Each structure stands twice: as C-alpha cells, then as structure tokens.
RNA sequence: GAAUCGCUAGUAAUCGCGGAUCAGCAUGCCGCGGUGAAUAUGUACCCGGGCCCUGUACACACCGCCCGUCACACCCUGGGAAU
C-alpha cells in the first residue's frame, strides 16, 4: 500500500483523482508492480508536463528483469552440479 | 574436521506448480511460475588460458628425457703368488 501510494506522494495531496483498476496473473509483488506502472502510464492526464516530475525519480519504466528461464544440463539458470 | 564445490541480479537461496517415460512409479531428469538479496577490490596472490621474448640434451614433446650404486645373466679383458 505504501508502495502503491508513493506514486502520488508528490505534486498531489491525494485529493484530486480517482482510480478504478484491475489486475491478474503472477504474484504478490508482480501485481503490485503492474498496478504501479499502470498508474504511471495513465498519469498522462496532463500529458506533456507530468513526465517532467516523474522521470526524475524513475516512475515511468518497467522492471525488465523478467524471469530467466531454465537452460538444460544445469539445475537452474546459473546453478550447476559438482564435478570431481 | 580438513578440505572442496556453486554462483555477479530476477541470479543465489527457498516456495511450490507442470510434463517426461509408464497399468502399477521419481529423493531423478525437463520445463513453469511465486518470493527474493550478498557482492563488485579487479589481476597482488595460488589458479587457468593466451602472447612473445629468451634457454632446452624434450618430439610419446616435462606424467619428458635421464645419471649412479646394488641384486641378475652371458661375454670379453687386466693384475696376480708360484709355472
């Protein structure tokens, strides 16, 4: 909740807007991030003037750390068995 | 225990979920997603690889070649009393 309210604890006393939302897929941190960045998209009600206040702190871009798959042979994407 | 192994950001660690072969079956394997950091001093060190510059009796290429005593067999030869 604190995480999803930071996106508007700047240049907004919270007393100006309404958000009707929805989210699916993934997990507890995935969904919260998804909602956060959706708000970050739709903060374009004032289009050419809010990305000013936003990009500075970094409230615009996705976390492109999408999970790294499992390769063969190993037991994970970087873990490896033990040779002697 | 000595040691020794695995890893530099969605990774480590754990969380389960899903296949596989198959009537009967996974602590195994393959895949998928949840959550999720430590640390970047960098080539000093052991380590590993390359360069090129020197030295080599090595070329099966140093786990290489290789010397010497002793134990062993055959062969040849010297000294040697006395002849």
């Amino acid at each position: 909740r604190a995480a999803l309210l930071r996106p508007l604890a700047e240049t907004k006393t919270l007393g100006r807007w309404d958000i009707k939302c929805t989210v699916k897929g993934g997990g507890t941190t995935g969904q919260v991030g998804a909602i956060q960045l959706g708000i970050s998209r739709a903060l374009q009600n004032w289009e050419p003037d809010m990305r000013t206040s936003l990009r500075a702190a970094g409230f615009l871009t996705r976390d492109s750390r999408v999970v790294e798959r499992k390769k063969p042979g190993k037991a994970k994407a970087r873990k490896s068995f033990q040779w002697v």
Side-chain angles (χ1 to χ4, degrees):
Chain A
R1 308 185 182 187
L4 289 179
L5 272 182
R6 301 280 174 170
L8 63 167
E10 74 268 14
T11 179
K12 178 181 184 180
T13 325
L14 265 58
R16 324 190 285 100
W17 276 348
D18 162 69
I19 45 176
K20 169 200 291 182
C21 327
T22 178
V23 59
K24 81 166 70 71
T28 60
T29 72
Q31 290 193 312
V32 51
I35 303 166
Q36 192 155 274
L37 261 291
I39 313 164
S40 315
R41 301 291 177 89
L43 289 208
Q44 60 192 58
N45 181 21
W46 284 288
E47 308 197 5
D49 42 353
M50 289 310 195
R51 291 183 63 244
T52 61
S53 298
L54 303 190
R55 174 95 164 176
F59 277 174
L60 289 196
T61 310
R62 175 198 328 297
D63 173 284
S64 43
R65 302 180 293 145
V66 193
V67 53
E68 174 162 290
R69 299 306 205 238
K70 185 177 174 313
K71 308 174 192 298
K74 309 193 173 301
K76 291 174 193 52
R78 288 170 148 124
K79 166 165 186 169
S80 48
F81 302 168
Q82 192 180 172
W83 72 79
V84 298

